[PDB]
Amino acid sequence: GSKAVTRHRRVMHFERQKLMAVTEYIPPKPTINPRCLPPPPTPPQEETGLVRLLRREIAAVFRDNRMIAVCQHVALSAEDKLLLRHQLRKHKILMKIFPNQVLKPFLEESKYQNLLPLFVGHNLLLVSEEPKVKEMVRILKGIPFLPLLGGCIDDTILSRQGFINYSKL
């Protein structure tokens, strides 16, 4: 004869075990699994202040400045990147980086949809007012493995050879 409460789990009577087994919980099982079922309609995303600011900045960049060069961003050292920034600001041309997730839709909606293959990997936008490509070509020639992908000079989409020809012009 054991007490009402024990430590050995107090193995129950056979009738009580049968009662527990019969009264065991049975979850509701739907006829068709809803995971792979035609999904519910789209819960549309809401535009945030960050993406709105990115769109506004990209629009301002594409409106104000003239030279918009697209280059392949190369993972270089911080000191070299800052030195390149200083050398570019000596000629007064700046650089920017924008995420592809917001850059691609704006580019395909705008008139610069021809630059989509240029923005697959790492990207860098060289922004210059009153373009002077000679100094940019000279400063890019100093680094061998940093290639100019293309860009637009006053609504004129050009490749690397086009940029070289324009600088020589």
């Binding site: 392949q72 961003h73 190369v74 993972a75 270089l76 050292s77 293959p117 240029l118 697959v120 990997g121 790492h122 061998p144 493995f145 940093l146 290639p147 100019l148 992908l149 293309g150 490749s159 690397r160 050879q161």
Partner: protein
Amino acid sequence: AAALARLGLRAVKQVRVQFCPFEKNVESTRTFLQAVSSEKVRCTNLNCSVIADVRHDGSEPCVDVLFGDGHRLIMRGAHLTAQEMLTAFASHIQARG
């Protein structure tokens, strides 16, 4: 970048990647170019010369690596994965070098 940095790239002379950015199959080529142009690879050895040739009508991305075993590894990468190109390049340079 870490795999190339830890493999000892001191035994390479020239690496050139010739590609056309306006094509539809240059993602892997540009990924390989960025991986081989990482700062760790640059600081591993300064005697190597890295060249990025940009074309418009070439339409055939390729990578040529000349190293001091008198060896020229040419990879015409138009459909290969960037990771596959990286691992094949690493396996070849470690085996011969």
